[PDB]
A paper describes a structure:
The Rho-family GTPase Rac1 activates the WAVE regulatory complex (WRC) to drive Arp2/3 complex-mediated actin polymerization in many essential processes. The WASP-family member WAVE exists exclusively in a 400-kDa, hetero-pentameric assembly named the WAVE Regulatory Complex (WRC). The studied complex is composed of a trimer formed by WAVE1, Abi2, and HSPC300, and a dimer formed by Sra1 and Nap1 subunits. Rac1 binds to WRC at two distinct sites—the A and D sites.
Numbering used by the authors:
A (entry chain B): 822 to 981, 988 to 1121
B (entry chain E): 3 to 106
C (entry chain A): 5 to 26, 57 to 337, 341 to 367, 380 to 539, 542 to 574, 578 to 784
D (entry chain C): 24 to 177, 499 to 518, 528 to 543
């Protein structure tokens, strides 16, 4: 029994009161304090990725061979560690999202004219502009509380060879993709409608993947759409593979882990439902939702 | 630029589709009767092969062009509406400024 | 001007960006064809008879013999009803000639000398199809008491005007009157005309044995075929048990197996005869000639496994297991991959058929067994019979389970139809490969044996099978082949060609019947000469080639395996009302029953399933337009959809707004207050979560050829509600 | 029969299928184009209105702006549009190909001609097929259920506001729509 109630500090009303007290300066300070921890966790994740690079590089290329892919997965190390770290990152990003929503609601209500100008400016920036200007625009908007596709605080925090770093980012996406079905075996992965999510917080992975992909592949000048598309292909393939199993222990929570693909595609501003349909039939998700909501 | 499409591209392609419909309906009967009353059946046969290949290619080409024209038309309209939304938002902001000035 | 250009056009057309979207055999063949034509004509008459609505219920009646306008209503009625009576005359002539033809075939086939030769299994199945056609036609004519009244009214009107003068005309009219007046006329004629034939029961025993065999081995794909087997079994048993024949003596000789048929009927007790007119299968046993003294033999006459909620665990398991594997398969390929796609297509079709069968069987059993006011506490005393067959006959769980199963059927159907090109290519390639491998490689050994032997009947047949279905990649059969001569192989590799094209229906049928001829118990036997492995491999190929015809037409069979059109039609129960009703209320319609149950209970789990229960209307309307082929049926379906969809939109919008208003109110409530209230046993309960997101994103719902933007209508209603809320607050 | 005859017949058949496909594609494209054209008309009208409104708004005078305190309520309030779509499955809405396949289906018997002789003065065909029957039955059920439920249940600105409340009281609010029937039923149920 913790000596406090978490809902009496993170409620919508409480977060709005905190925004009233703190203002944009205090909220920016809070966000920076959170991105520090995210950067720490990402450093650890990069360590784990580099200590697996050979097997990961092979898995990135042999996703068409179920037997060879299973053989490769057998040799990976520290998988539950990767999942735990990404869950922590997702939890921190969820807290940030709550705080940003509170701040936006307060600001749009105290200073409507500045907020209207800011929103008009952000919405209609030419999509052909480069990263330098868009970063300043997004930084202003985020200070105002609006939500942005690419978080500028995270982009700044994750910058503290370059081609080696790009390769490491791609293999981090691969690692996290292929490790998902390990969550079915866990017993705390139950999806609860009273929670609208899982007991052990694996529903924040949507935040984790989307935000981390955006940040890294803006830092290393990639293509966020393509990288997230590859991640979706791999994750869908892995979960489809676990689909045919029959063990009553390694598939205790197949439906709950299936719902994560839907959560990820919903959160992402780069992934649409057409891609998910092409790679993962939606009837499976419909049946999973029926099963959990029983 | 949108008028060039609306007035004559899409309607022209639709009329072309109707013409192809009629021509193919006639060519089917022509090929059948030609084979029936042909001295050499083999020659009639590869001729029918040629007509069917030509018909398939032409229909595919026409459908492709119509689809492209419709796609471009929709995209242009979406761009217009985005621009007009921006202008309307500006007008709303101006009206709000005026009302606040009057109140002050 | 070439395949390359056309194919390139198609390819470039299939890549545009489309987002935001989510001898002794020829005579047999000829007779078989004629019999099939008679079958289709009989189906036409059956549909004519099912959708017959009384036209004499609208003709004004005459009270006094001096009604001022009596002649000129008689002229009206004769002109109205002349073509309907033409239809009935044609029906009578058809049934008479059909019985003549069937009995002629049965007589020819049973001839003492000819009872030795074989008859292809396909011919036996077609004979079963006639016996079933006669059964359905007789029962239809029995139910429909409106045709009698229509003909009587026409006859009175026509005689009052002296419209008929000829002697032949009066004789034909009075023959039609006899036909319509009687009861079980068609079956009685069939019996009286069969029994004159000596030893007719042996052919029927053959039919029933074949049907029992097929049903046991699961040699069917569509639910229609599965039920046809049982109907043929039952009606064949009924016919066989006449005066000159006794099925219990015939069973004592181990000629038929009554225990197997009894077990089958016990497991499955009702099947849809036509439309919504069911047939209880034990009714054939009950009414047989010698049933009473042998009543103890059957246990299918008493009365369990129709609780659809029991099969749902298995249905869900199979759904997920199959779709997970199918989703993996979404350049030239090896034969193994094409064979896998063939297996997967067949397996998906079988699963779809099985699910459709579950749903329809439950529906039929429910229809034949209406509830009462003691069984169901909520059933009102003044409940119509149809209202008691459908509306009050289902529990909540049963309705939810039916919706689940229908949704699974429709989802898997769209998935399977999406892969129609890959399945077509894979299926054709596998069929061609299997047929050519068999013909060219497997038939070399038996042909060599037969050449090394005096017997030449086998040689003629095997050689005939080779001419029929061999595609010699060099155009001619190899000449230095030693197997053809007789000498042993030294070897002699032959390269079998590959290509994606299936055998025409005629030649596939010929090949299958000739193979059946070789491995035949009766033919002095052709199977005696053959060796062991030869017959074993022939039996194999003959068994797998059963489904080739079905699979080559993948789209049609996929359509057939997922047919749920009959849940709407109610002509039978409408006829039983004796004119009291012209149609039933929507709250008695099955699709609306299911959809409205989901809407009213506000079930969270089932909220994603509603649109499939609505979709049922599409299948029903398409069926009415294309098969029944009647305008007024589509008019009625359209009116029903018009009313029910507006009701659906209203209810959905109302409950959506209520749900989100409650969530908004609950989010902002003080948390410490909730804690305190719970600590004193006065909990302010949370609102149950629910799944409305999928519905709010719908923008091209499809109903009866219209595209409906659900989002727009929900927005209109919700905005009205928001304005009302603000006004109420102020 | 020679096989080449069958192959040629099949080739003619596929050409006929190509022609049918052409007609169906034309139908789809026309259905798209018509509504796109309607959108274009609406967009042009809205653009004209926006241009007018912008030139009008640029010349608003705040210092000269005068507000009538006395006329606060006697002014007519602005009301947003309340259009709500219904009857989406009327016969008018039928697509063209579905109508084509509907018109080849068998028509009901010409049972209307009996109408002039009927004493009841009802249509002849309404005894053969009544699509309006469902609606009538539903309405009747709704009406009696509602009645049964009801039975079972049982300064100068000061002048301006006074006039406003008087108008609101006197100018109160003032059917064959399903939504209205359901609303009345539920309202009586409360």
């Amino acid at each position: 029994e913790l000596t406090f109630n978490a809902e009496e500090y993170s409620d919508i009303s409480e977060m709005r009161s905190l925004s009233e007290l703190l203002g944009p300066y205090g909220m920016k300070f809070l966000s920076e304090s959170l991105m520090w921890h995210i950067s720490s966790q990402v450093a650890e994740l990069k360590k784990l990725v580099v200590e697996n690079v050979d097997v990961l590089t092979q898995m990135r290329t042999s996703f068409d061979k179920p037997d060879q892919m299973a053989a490769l997965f057998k040799r990976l190390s520290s998988v539950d560690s990767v999942l735990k770290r990404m869950t922590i990152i997702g939890v921190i990003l969820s807290f940030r999202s709550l705080a940003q929503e509170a701040l936006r609601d307060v600001l749009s209500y105290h200073i409507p004219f500045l907020v209207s100008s800011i929103e008009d400016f952000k919405d209609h920036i030419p999509r052909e502009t480069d990263m330098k200007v868009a970063m300043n625009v997004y930084e202003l908007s985020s200070a105002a509380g609006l939500p942005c596709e690419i978080d500028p605080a995270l982009v700044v925090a994750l910058s503290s060879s370059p081609e080696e770093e790009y390769k490491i980012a791609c293999l981090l996406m691969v690692f996290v993709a292929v490790s998902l079905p390990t969550l079915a075996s866990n017993v705390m992965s139950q999806y609860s409608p009273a929670i609208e999510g899982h007991c052990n917080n694996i529903h924040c992975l949507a935040k984790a993947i989307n935000q981390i992909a955006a940040a890294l592949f803006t830092i290393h000048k990639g293509s966020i759409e393509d990288r997230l598309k590859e991640f979706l292909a791999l994750a869908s393939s892995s979960l489809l593979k676990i689909g045919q199993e029959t063990d009553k222990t390694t598939t205790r929570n197949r439906e709950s882990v299936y719902l994560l693909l839907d959560m990820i595609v919903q959160e992402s501003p780069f992934l649409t439902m057409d891609l998910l349909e092409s790679c993962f039939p939606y009837v499976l998700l419909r049946n999973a939702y029926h099963a959990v909501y029983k | 630029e949108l008028q060039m499409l609306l007035e004559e591209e899409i309607p022209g392609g639709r009329r072309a589709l109707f013409d192809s419909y009629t021509n193919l309906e006639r060519v089917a009967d022509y090929c059948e009767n030609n084979y029936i009353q042909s001295a050499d059946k083999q020659r009639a046969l590869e001729e029918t092969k040629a007509y069917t290949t030509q018909s398939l290619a032409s229909v595919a080409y026409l459908i492709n062009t119509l689809a492209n024209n419709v796609l471009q038309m929709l995209d242009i309209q979406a761009s217009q509406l985005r621009r007009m939304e921006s202008s309307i938002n500006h007008i709303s902001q101006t009206v709000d400024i005026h009302k606040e000035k009057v109140a002050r | 001007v070439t395949l390359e250009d056309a194919l390139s056009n198609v390819d470039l057309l299939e890549e545009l960006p489309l987002p935001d979207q989510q001898a002794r055999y020829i005579e047999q063949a000829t007779v078989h064809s004629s019999m099939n034509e008679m079958l289709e004509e009989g189906q036409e008459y059956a549909v004519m008879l099912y959708t017959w609505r009384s036209c004499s219920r609208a003709i004004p009646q005459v009270k006094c013999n001096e009604q001022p306008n009596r002649v000129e209503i008689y002229e009206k009625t004769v002109e109205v009803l002349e073509p309907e009576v033409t239809k009935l005359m044609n029906f009578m002539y058809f049934q008479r000639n059909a019985i003549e033809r069937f009995c002629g075939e049965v007589r020819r086939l049973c001839h003492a000398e000819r009872r030795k030769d074989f008859v292809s299994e396909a011919y036996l199945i077609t004979l079963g199809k006639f016996i079933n056609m006669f059964a359905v036609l007789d029962e239809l004519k029995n139910m429909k008491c409106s045709v009698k009244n229509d003909h009587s009214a026409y006859k009175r009107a026509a005689q009052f005007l002296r419209k008929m003068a000829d002697p032949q005309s009066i004789q034909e009219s009075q023959n039609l009157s006899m036909f319509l007046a009687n009861h079980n006329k068609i079956t009685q004629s069939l019996q009286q005309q069969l029994e004159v034939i000596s030893g007719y029961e042996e052919l029927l025993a053959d039919i029933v044995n074949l049907c029992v065999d097929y049903y046991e081995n699961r040699m069917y794909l569509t639910p229609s075929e599965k039920h046809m087997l049982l109907k043929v079994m039952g009606f064949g048993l009924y016919l066989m048990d006449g005066s000159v024949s006794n099925i219990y003596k015939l069973d004592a000789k181990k000629r038929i197996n009554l225990s197997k048929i009894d077990k089958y009927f016990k497991q499955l007790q009702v099947v849809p005869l036509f439309g919504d007119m069911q047939i209880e299968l034990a009714r054939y046993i009950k009414t047989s000639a010698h049933y009473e003294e042998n009543k103890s033999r059957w246990t299918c006459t008493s009365s369990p496994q129709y609780n659809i909620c029991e099969q749902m665990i298995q249905i869900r398991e199979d759904h997920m297991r199959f779709i997970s594997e199918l989703a993996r398969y979404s350049a030239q390929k090896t034969d193994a991959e094409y064979r896998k796609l063939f297996d997967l297509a067949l397996q998906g079709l079988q699963l779809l058929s099985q699910w459709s069968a579950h749903v329809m069987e439950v529906y039929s059993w429910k229809l034949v067994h209406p509830t009462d006011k003691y069984s169901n506490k909520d059933c009102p005393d003044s409940a119509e019979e149809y209202e008691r067959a459908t509306r009050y006959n289902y529990t909540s769980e049963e309705k939810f389970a039916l919706v689940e199963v229908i949704a699974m059927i429709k989802g898997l159907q769209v998935l399977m139809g999406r892969m129609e090109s890959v399945f077509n290519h894979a299926i054709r390639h596998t069929v061609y490969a299997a047929l050519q491998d068999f013909s060219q490689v497997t038939l070399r050994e038996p042909l060599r044996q037969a050449i090394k032997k005096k017997k030449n009947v086998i040689q003629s047949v095997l050689q005939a099978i080779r001419k029929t279905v061999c595609d010699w990649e060099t155009g001619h059969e190899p000449f230095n082949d030693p197997a053809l001569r007789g000498e042993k192989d030294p070897g002699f590799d032959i390269k079998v060609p590959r290509r994606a094209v299936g055998p025409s229906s005629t030649q596939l049928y010929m090949v299958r019947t000739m193979l059946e001829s070789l491995i035949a118990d009766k033919s002095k036997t052709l199977r005696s000469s053959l060796e062991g492995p030869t017959i074993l491999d022939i039996e194999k190929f003959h068994r797998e080639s059963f489904f080739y015809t079905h699979l080559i037409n993948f789209s049609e069979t996929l359509q057939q395996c997922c047919d749920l059109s009959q849940l709407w039609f109610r002509e039978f129960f409408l006829e039983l009302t004796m004119g009291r009703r012209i149609q039933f209320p929507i709250e008695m319609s099955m699709p609306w029953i299911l959809t409205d149950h989901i809407l009213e209970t506000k079930e969270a789990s089932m909220m994603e399933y509603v649109l499939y229960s609505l979709d049922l209307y599409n299948d029903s309307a398409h069926y009415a337009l294309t098969r029944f082929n009647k305008q007024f049926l589509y008019d009625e379906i359209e009116a029903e959809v018009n009313l029910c969809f507006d009701q659906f939109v209203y209810k959905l919008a109302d409950q959506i707004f209520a749900y989100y208003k409650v969530m908004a109110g609950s989010l902002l409530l003080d948390k410490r207050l909730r804690s305190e209230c719970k600590n004193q046993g006065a909990t302010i309960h949370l609102p149950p979560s629910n799944r409305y997101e999928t519905l709010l994103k719908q923008r091209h719902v499809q109903l009866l050829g219209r595209s409906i933007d659900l989002n727009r209508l929900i927005t209109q209603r919700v905005s009205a509600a928001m304005y009302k809320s603000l006004e109420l607050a102020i | 029969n020679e096989l080449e005859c069958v192959t040629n017949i099949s080739l003619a058949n596929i050409i006929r299928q190509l022609s049918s496909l052409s007609k169906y594609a034309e139908d789809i494209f026309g259905e798209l184009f018509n509504e796109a054209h309607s959108f274009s008309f609406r967009v042009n009208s809205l653009q004209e209105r926006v241009d007018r409104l912008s030139v009008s708004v640029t010349q608003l005078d705040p210092k000269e702006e005068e507000l009538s305190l006395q006329d606060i309520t006697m002014r007519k309030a602005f009301r947003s549009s309340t259009i709500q779509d219904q009857q989406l499955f009327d016969r008018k809405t039928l697509p063209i190909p579905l109508q084509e396949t509907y018109d080849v289906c068998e028509q009901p018997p010409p049972l209307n001609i009996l109408t002039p002789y009927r004493d009841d003065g009802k249509e002849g065909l309404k005894f053969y097929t009544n699509p309006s029957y469902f609606f009538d039955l539903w309405k009747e059920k709704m009406l009696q259920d509602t009645e049964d439920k009801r039975k079972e249940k049982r300064s100068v600105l000061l002048e301006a506001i006074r006039k406003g409340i008087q108008l609101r009281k006197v100018e109160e609010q003032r059917e064959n729509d399903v939504a209205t029937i359901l609303s009345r039923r539920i309202a009586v149920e409360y």
